[PDB]
Design an enzyme around this catalytic site. Structure first.
Site, PDB file in Angstrom:
ATOM      1  N   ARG A   1      22.655  -0.347 -46.601  1.00  0.00           N
ATOM      2  CA  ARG A   1      22.020  -0.224 -47.843  1.00  0.00           C
ATOM      3  C   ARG A   1      20.554  -0.597 -47.865  1.00  0.00           C
ATOM      4  NH1 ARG A   1      20.998  -4.526 -52.810  1.00  0.00           N
ATOM      5  NH2 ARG A   1      19.985  -3.125 -54.099  1.00  0.00           N
TER       6      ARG A   1
ATOM      7  N   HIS B   1      13.524  -0.937 -56.083  1.00  0.00           N
ATOM      8  CA  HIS B   1      13.866  -2.353 -55.618  1.00  0.00           C
ATOM      9  C   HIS B   1      12.426  -2.638 -55.667  1.00  0.00           C
ATOM     10  CE1 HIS B   1      16.415  -5.040 -53.108  1.00  0.00           C
ATOM     11  NE2 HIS B   1      15.497  -5.962 -53.462  1.00  0.00           N
TER      12      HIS B   1
ATOM     13  N   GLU C   1      18.474  -5.335 -59.689  1.00  0.00           N
ATOM     14  CA  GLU C   1      18.265  -6.599 -60.375  1.00  0.00           C
ATOM     15  C   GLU C   1      17.123  -6.567 -61.447  1.00  0.00           C
ATOM     16  OE1 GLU C   1      17.150  -9.874 -57.584  1.00  0.00           O
ATOM     17  OE2 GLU C   1      19.087  -9.804 -56.454  1.00  0.00           O
TER      18      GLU C   1
ATOM     19  N   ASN D   1      24.816  -8.627 -56.756  1.00  0.00           N
ATOM     20  CA  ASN D   1      24.158  -9.610 -56.007  1.00  0.00           C
ATOM     21  C   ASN D   1      24.434 -10.940 -56.374  1.00  0.00           C
ATOM     22  OD1 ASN D   1      23.184  -7.262 -54.905  1.00  0.00           O
ATOM     23  ND2 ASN D   1      21.219  -7.477 -55.707  1.00  0.00           N
TER      24      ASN D   1
ATOM     25  N   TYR E   1      23.996 -15.253 -54.752  1.00  0.00           N
ATOM     26  CA  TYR E   1      23.620 -16.028 -53.816  1.00  0.00           C
ATOM     27  C   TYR E   1      24.145 -17.385 -54.143  1.00  0.00           C
ATOM     28  CZ  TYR E   1      20.673 -12.623 -51.965  1.00  0.00           C
ATOM     29  OH  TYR E   1      20.006 -11.523 -51.443  1.00  0.00           O
TER      30      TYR E   1
ATOM     31  N   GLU F   1      24.450  -7.565 -52.212  1.00  0.00           N
ATOM     32  CA  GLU F   1      23.660  -8.483 -51.495  1.00  0.00           C
ATOM     33  C   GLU F   1      24.648  -9.931 -51.739  1.00  0.00           C
ATOM     34  OE1 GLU F   1      19.210  -7.052 -52.734  1.00  0.00           O
ATOM     35  OE2 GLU F   1      19.384  -9.367 -52.785  1.00  0.00           O
TER      36      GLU F   1
END
Length: 441
Positions: free
Chosen positions: A74, A118, A163, A290, A292, A347
């Site tokens: 990606r 992005h 995002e 995504n 985290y 991600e």
């Protein structure tokens, strides 16, 4: 324990964070070239002027991807390489770079996933109002149409935005990221135009109908847990989930903004034209997720009635809590609420302080532990009914981490930014083994 045959193991980057060559081959200025020239905005005064020098060194990086056995890679496309200026004319050198990258991925049996946006908006679009202007949705559709006409049936997976929540919050609420505005009342207007741009780009993709290709959008999420069992904390956590995690998914899937969103941005309906919610909610082929870290929330008496509570341990070098069960819960929640649509984790990864040893090796066991827990949580989700189609480690390479500059290393491959030498970290060696085993040991 094995993943399904054909599961797509990958790694991810973005254009401003790795490419460098910021003023070469006709490339125009982006909002992030301008932003990084502002004293005080970036740690250490760092910029993406050189970064990983990947525009020049992309063949070395292709061979690293092949050494790991990646099934997919990606990347993002720098819009300002493609349309450097307000003439809207296509820069052929910039387009040729992505053609050569995509040809190199296929030569090595690596499936391209391209993110169209992005964050590195061309400064000429910003000069015409950027995401405050409705017209930027049409500019973004024209850019998408040019790239999908050029490369559509060579890139089997396209993402429109990366995002959009971060672009709204960091770019317009807090002024921490380009273009640096600090006016919370603008968030809804910006969110709507980001969504409209995704919708209009998706219409352009459907009209071209490239052979074998699919298009989606990548959203980030923080799984929300209340700090206690008390009703007020539970209510605050539900309200925070609706806003933080569903601001974009609710209009994308259901064609309406949720109540938390309309309360946060009371003027949002003024930006909605009669066909816009239908355009925004036309069906996507997949969702990019995504993730985290979770967020832990409690109720407060002060507006807006919600307090996010910081966690001191266990955390990464970003101070982001490590909780792999948050990925499992996020994936199950999306699937139960919005249905079993195809998902890629576009991600997931971690920043730690990496240092080569005296022998030159980079051993990052904390990063291994982060992936071991998160890939295990993703496997459980898939076993429990999530249509998980692939997993992209953020990042292939240590790179420019936005306002943190080069102070944070997310790569599975270490980059010496003085010499550009790449070294596989322990985590890349470990991940190669995961790919080859199609699952954890």
């Amino acid at each position: 324990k094995k993943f399904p045959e054909g599961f797509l193991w990958g790694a991810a980057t973005s254009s401003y964070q790795i490419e460098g060559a910021w003023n070469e081959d006709g490339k125009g200025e982006s909002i992030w070239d301008r932003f990084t020239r502002i004293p005080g905005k970036i740690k250490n005064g760092d910029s993406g002027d050189v970064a990983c020098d990947h525009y020049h060194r992309y063949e070395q990086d292709l061979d690293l991807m092949r050494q790991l056995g990646l099934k997919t890679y990606r990347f993002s496309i720098a819009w300002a390489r493609i349309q450097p200026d307000s003439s809207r004319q296509i820069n052929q050198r910039g387009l040729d770079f992505y053609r050569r990258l995509v040809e190199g991925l296929h030569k090595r049996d690596i499936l391209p996933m391209a993110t169209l946006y992005h964050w590195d908006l061309p400064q000429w679009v910003e000069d015409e109002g950027g995401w405050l202007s409705r017209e930027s949705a049409s500019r973004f559709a024209e850019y998408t149409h040019a790239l999908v006409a050029a490369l559509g049936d060579q890139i089997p997976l396209w993402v429109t935005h990366n995002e959009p929540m971060v672009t709204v919050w960091a770019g317009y609420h807090m002024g921490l990221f380009a273009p640096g505005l600090k006016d919370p009342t603008l968030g809804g207007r910006v969110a709507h135009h980001l969504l409209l741009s995704h919708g209009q780009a998706l219409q352009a993709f459907r009209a071209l109908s490239p052979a074998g290709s699919q298009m989606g959008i990548t959203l980030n999420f923080n799984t929300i847990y209340p700090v206690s069992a008390e009703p007020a904390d539970v209510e605050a956590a539900r309200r925070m989930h609706s806003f933080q995690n569903e601001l974009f998914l609710e209009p994308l899937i259901r064609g309406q903004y949720n109540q938390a969103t309309l309360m946060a941005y009371p003027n949002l309906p003024e930006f909605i034209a009669p066909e816009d919610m239908q355009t925004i909610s036309a069906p996507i082929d997949f969702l990019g997720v995504n993730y985290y870290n979770p967020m832990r929330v409690k109720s407060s008496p002060q507006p807006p009635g919600i307090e996010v509570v910081q966690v001191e341990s266990p955390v990464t070098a970003m101070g982001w809590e490590i909780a792999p069960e948050g990925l499992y819960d996020l994936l199950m929640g999306i699937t139960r609420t919005y249905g079993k649509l195809p998902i890629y984790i576009t991600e997931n990864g971690a920043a730690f302080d990496d240092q080569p040893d005296q022998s030159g090796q980079v051993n990052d066991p904390q990063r291994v532990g982060y992936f071991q827990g998160h890939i295990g949580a993703a496997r459980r989700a898939l076993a429990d009914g999530v249509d998980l189609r692939g997993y992209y480690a953020w990042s292939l390479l240590d790179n420019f981490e936005w306002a943190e500059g080069y102070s944070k290393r997310f790569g599975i491959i270490y980059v010496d930014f003085e010499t550009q030498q790449r070294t596989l970290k322990q985590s890349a060696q470990w991940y190669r083994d995961v790919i080859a085993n199609n699952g954890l040991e």
